[PDB]
């Protein structure tokens, strides 16, 4: 039982660390995503300005 | 959605630029047109003055 318990507290900490890893990935994908927004604008006025 | 929106603002700016391009063409065709008015006069009195 005790071993299980201490590994469950460690399980909580584990999953929290995993969330944080993901949050790093999501800041990165957030900025990448905003870049793609800017790109999309540049493609649209590339559309008009191609004429 | 957000991408669509920003491309819609860019769509507004696009069409405005297109209008301006046209306005350039329409100043040009305006002056050309006035020339053809003068020409028409010169052809009419070329009509009489041919006699």
Written as one string, the DSSP assignment of B7-51 is: HHHHHHHHHHHHHHHHHHHHHHHHHHHHHHHHHHHHHHHHHHHT-
**Interface test mutation site (partner A, options B1, B5, B6, B25, max chain A beta carbons within 10 A):** B6
With beta carbons under 8 A apart, name residues in chain B contacting A36. 3
Give yes or no for a contact between A40 and B7, defined as CB atoms under 8 angstroms apart.
yes
Dihedral sign, CA of B6, B12, B14, B17?
negative
- At how many Å resolution was this determined? 4.3
With beta carbons under 8 A apart, name residues in chain B contacting A45. 10, 13-14
Q: How was this structure determined?
A: cryo-EM
CA dihedral B44, B28, B23, B6 (to 10 degrees): 150
Give yes or no for a contact between A40 and B3, defined as CB atoms under 8 angstroms apart.
yes
């Amino acid at each position: 039982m005790r071993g299980q318990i201490r590994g469950l507290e460690m399980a909580s900490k584990n999953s929290q660390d995993g969330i944080s890893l993901i949050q790093t990935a999501e800041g990165a994908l957030t900025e990448t995503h905003a870049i793609l927004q800017r790109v999309r604008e540049l493609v649209v006025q590339a559309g008009n300005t191609g004429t």
